[PDB]
Amino acid sequence: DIISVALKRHSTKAFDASKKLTAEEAEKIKTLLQYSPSSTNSQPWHFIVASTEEGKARVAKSAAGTYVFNERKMLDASHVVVFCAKTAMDDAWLERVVDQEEADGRFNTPEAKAANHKGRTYFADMHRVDLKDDDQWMAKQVYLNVGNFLLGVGAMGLDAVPIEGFDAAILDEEFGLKEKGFTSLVVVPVGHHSVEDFNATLPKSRLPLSTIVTEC
Amino acid sequence: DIISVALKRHSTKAFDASKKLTAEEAEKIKTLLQYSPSSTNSQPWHFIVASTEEGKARVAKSAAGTYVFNERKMLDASHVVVFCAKTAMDDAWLERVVDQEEADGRFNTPEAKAANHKGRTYFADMHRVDLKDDDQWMAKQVYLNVGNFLLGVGAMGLDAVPIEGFDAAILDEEFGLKEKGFTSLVVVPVGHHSVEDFNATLPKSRLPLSTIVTEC
Numbered sequence: 381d382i383i384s385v386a387l388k389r390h391s392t393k394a395f396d397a398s399k400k401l402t403a404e405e406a407e408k409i410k411t412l413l414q415y416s417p418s419s420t421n422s423q424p425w426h427f428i429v430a431s432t433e434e435g436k437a438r439v440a441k442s443a444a445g446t447y448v449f450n451e452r453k454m455l456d457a458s459h460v461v462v463f464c465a466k467t468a469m470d471d472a473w474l475e476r477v478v479d480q481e482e483a484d485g486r487f488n489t490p491e492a493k494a495a496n497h498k499g500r501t502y503f504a505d506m507h508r509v510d511l512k513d514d515d516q517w518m519a520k521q522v523y524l525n526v527g528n529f530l531l532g533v534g535a536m537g538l539d540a541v542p543i544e545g546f547d548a549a550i551l552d553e554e555f556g557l558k559e560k561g562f563t564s565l566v567v568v569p570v571g572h573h574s575v576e577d578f579n580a581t582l583p584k585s586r587l588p589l590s591t592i593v594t595e596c
Numbered sequence: 597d598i599i600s601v602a603l604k605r606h607s608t609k610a611f612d613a614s615k616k617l618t619a620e621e622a623e624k625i626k627t628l629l630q631y632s633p634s635s636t637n638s639q640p641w642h643f644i645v646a647s648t649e650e651g652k653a654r655v656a657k658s659a660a661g662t663y664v665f666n667e668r669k670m671l672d673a674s675h676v677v678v679f680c681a682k683t684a685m686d687d688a689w690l691e692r693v694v695d696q697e698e699a700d701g702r703f704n705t706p707e708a709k710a711a712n713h714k715g716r717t718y719f720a721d722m723h724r725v726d727l728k729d730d731d732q733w734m735a736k737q738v739y740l741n742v743g744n745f746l747l748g749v750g751a752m753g754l755d756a757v758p759i760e761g762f763d764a765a766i767l768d769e770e771f772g773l774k775e776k777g778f779t780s781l782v783v784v785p786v787g788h789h790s791v792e793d794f795n796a797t798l799p800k801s802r803l804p805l806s807t808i809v810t811e812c
């Protein structure tokens with residue numbers, strides 16, 4: 381039951397460094413990242429999937445200073461995903477999305493493709509020109525991806541922990557993201573928790589529905 | 597199989613106005629909204645769940661002008677969820693979160709609670725005082741909730757569609773969110789698609805892994 385997964389998954393505070401994702405699981409988590417929905421299917425993202433020791437160690441460099449409490453999670457997990465958002469929405473990217481959809485057979489007529497292009501351009505320009513907030517708009521799509529991902533890995537029986545406790549500037553520099561047109565937002569170590577994960581047995585806590593929900 | 601769900605779920609284009617969520621399903625989608633994770637368990641959100649014709653009509657007021665193409669989805673769906681983010685992170689809310697966590701048994705000592713409170717305050721001030729972007733920080737947590745929600749309802753066998761194509765100013769005014777300290781970000785109609793929901797048979801389309809993923 382997906383609801384049971386929701387009530388059972390937790391933020392892993394300690395991973396068993398000897399437990400690696402299987403080849404099939406490694407392929408599956410990439411599928412999750414790739415198929416997350418997004419506004420106008422803009423997929424304004426890039427993902428770094430570190431599974432080698434040096435790769436994870438390079439990501440771990442961002443858990444410096446006060447963020448050191450997140451270093452072990454990045455080092456011990458099997459696969460560490462760095463969720464990145466594009467820094468600017470370029471026409472090239474927008475054309476790539478519609479051309480991919482065309483190549484994937486989503487348009488039965490030329491009019492169908494044009495309508496799709498028209499709609500994406502409307503949203504893209506509203507953010508790039510009118511509101512001048514495409515950077516924030518894209519980052520929002522990436523967090524949506526993170527949300528999709530966390531529930532997904534949980535449903536796969538894998539453990540993970542979403543991390544904002546890292547120096548993005550350091551991480552960006554380490555992987556030359558700036559030059560590539562991206563910036564790091566969330567780091568997500570994925571693997572299996574050890575019996576040492578104190579958060580694995582603590583009850584989950586959320587504010588009451590009477591407070592967060594309004595029915596009408 | 598969550599991966600099959602990710603490869604099958606889709607943005608519903610039309611809902612069967614006669615098919616409603618069962619009472620149990622209605623409780624489950626609220627559980628999904630409530631239990632989504634968030635930075636420091638800040639839960640900087642509020643949800644409007646419209647299930648009555650009068651309620652859906654109020655939300656549909658936001659599908660005006662350019663957004664009229666989204667009106668039908670908001671009116672025909674069984675339940676319409678409006679995802680809202682806090683406009684500013686106040687100490688009162690942070691207090692609520694830590695007190696609830698204590699009530700839920702997450703702390704073994706008073707010192708443990710104080711430490712958790714200090715840490716959350718640190719992160720909150722980093723956004724409130726330093727970066728002056730707590731509004732964007734909280735909105736990101738909401739989108740993550742949306743991402744969790746869409747995969748969740750998909751795994752429930754339910755149909756839904758995320759909507760950014762609505763006038764938030766109109767929606768905010770209609771529900772007096774401003775005064776309550778919230779602002780609408782995404783509208784998500786939930787229910788069962790109709791025979792005419794063409795997007796149900798069209799193949800999904802995403803850019804290739806060779807473009808979006810970097811393995812290290």
Ligand SMILES: Cc1cc2nc3c(=O)[nH]c(=O)nc-3n(C[C@H](O)[C@H](O)[C@H](O)COP(=O)(O)O)c2cc1C
Pocket residue numbers: 389390391392393450541542543544545546566584631632633634635636637740
């Ligand atoms: C965007 C985001 C950033 C987070 N940052 C950290 C972090 O840096 N380190 C850590 O251990 N947990 C971090 N958390 C975990 C939260 O504290 C956690 O999701 C919340 O307390 C609810 O508990 P749960 O994930 O076990 O359901 C983060 C969560 C999200 C969703």
Ligand SMILES: Cc1cc2nc3c(=O)[nH]c(=O)nc-3n(C[C@H](O)[C@H](O)[C@H](O)COP(=O)(O)O)c2cc1C
Pocket residue numbers: 415416417418419420421524605606607609666757758759760761762782800
């Ligand atoms: C934040 C967000 C906003 C969206 N806005 C709309 C919308 O206003 N109307 C609509 O019909 N679809 C909307 N979409 C649907 C996208 O176009 C869709 O998720 C994407 O093309 C991928 O297709 P899929 O959801 O079927 O996998 C939105 C999606 C997200 C994630």
